[PDB]
Amino acid sequence: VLLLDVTPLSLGIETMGGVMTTLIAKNTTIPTKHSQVFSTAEDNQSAVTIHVLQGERKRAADNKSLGQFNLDGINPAPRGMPQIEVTFDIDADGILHVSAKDKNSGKEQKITIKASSGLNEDEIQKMVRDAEANAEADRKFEELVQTRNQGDHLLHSTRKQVEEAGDKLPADDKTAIESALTALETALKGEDKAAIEAKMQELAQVSQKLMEI
Template sequence: DAGLRASDITEVILVGGQTRMPKVQQAVAEFFGKEPRKDVNPDEAVALGAAIQGGVLAGDVKDVLLLDVTPLSLGIETLGGVFTKIIEKNTTIPTKASQVFSTAEDNQSAVTVHVLQGEREQARFNKSLAKFDLSGIEPAPRGLPQVEVSFDIDANGILHVSAKDKKTNKEQKVEIKAGSGLSDDEIQRMVADAEANREEDKKFHELVQARNQADGLIHATRSAITEHGSKVGGDVIGKVESALADLETAMKGDDKGQIEAKTKALEEAGQSLYAAAAAGEQQPGGNAGGAHASSASSDD
């Protein structure tokens, strides 16, 4: 992760009594291309390091900087079951990061923030740390409300997560203790699992993106039908409704290519709807709705 080679390591310190075994020391020397240091007692290494860190946190030790890192990425579950990372793994702590998200439905008054730890693109394969709701969001079309989700890890490894509606300033917070996560063995297993399933996760992410894009187009098209439906012929509306139904059916499956093809077909049908609406408003008596047609076209 650091982009280093074994030969770039300048010093190797053995930790733990088992590293006294000659075979372990031989394997370490062969891997790094240098002998490990012998002047640090492996049985005392962890205690000495903890004592130094305690001195740093207490302010008694000022000439030593010990950098701890997040062993796995931290983030939240977003639309489609995707794990969206907010703090990447191996980020030095303390650290802060935030991202702005929005609603998935019209007039949605609350959002659920599902905090996760891991490396898989699919949220369900990561470690669930907490889940909380932010309510009181003012009714608005989906995508308009702005909810800022912030992650803050302090020097003690405690994670503070907050979600704030930027319009109303309503906020919810949760604190996750350092011991709420995973053991070293579990971390290694999750990293290996993410690497082994990299290709599968890539396909999953692409499928979710195709579904989300299709869902957005369906929502925009239905709004266009509501606004312009009375201005165009039934044959145009029929073609758009047919394309809508085809895309909704495709979205229920896992064929990304089919979803993309039906999305393109709906885009083309939608363009014919806008063209017919614009033509209809150019007829005598159609000036009253002209501004609405122009606005809808520019938004598309």
């Protein structure tokens, strides 16, 4: 064939830290469908937002919003435990159906997005150009959010390890962990990946007794 219908830009959802996670890649022939499992960002999270985006940028905010919906009634559980299946299905007429279903509760929500939605030919071309021109910057942003989430994972696992130990962890150790946790908290608000990792390192260097418990 010399011609066919494609979806012209990547389609995905916003994930923790403001990154766009792609479900359908740009130039995929239509009709198409793809599903991926997602989980919750925080402990005890009973609801998630499914924000549908079109574009090639790593920052969710730089892509075109197509719509959004909430999925509630998730049983409060530790982060990463819920299994939320997100499905993108584009029919032959370019109509996009997005659904999210929580495996444990069976709760499901969906949205229909018209074929005329999103970016026009000129905006599609500008999207592709802007993504290529910002390839390195977008990669650095993705690496920063990965470290910010990891830094928050180290902050989460440390604080949980402190509470379980309680009286067992010495004073000199606990107070120095607390000060290293705040230095990590402050660096996480910044955009310097190495600064965050150095604060994580400084935390680990004062958590030696905490790890043994």
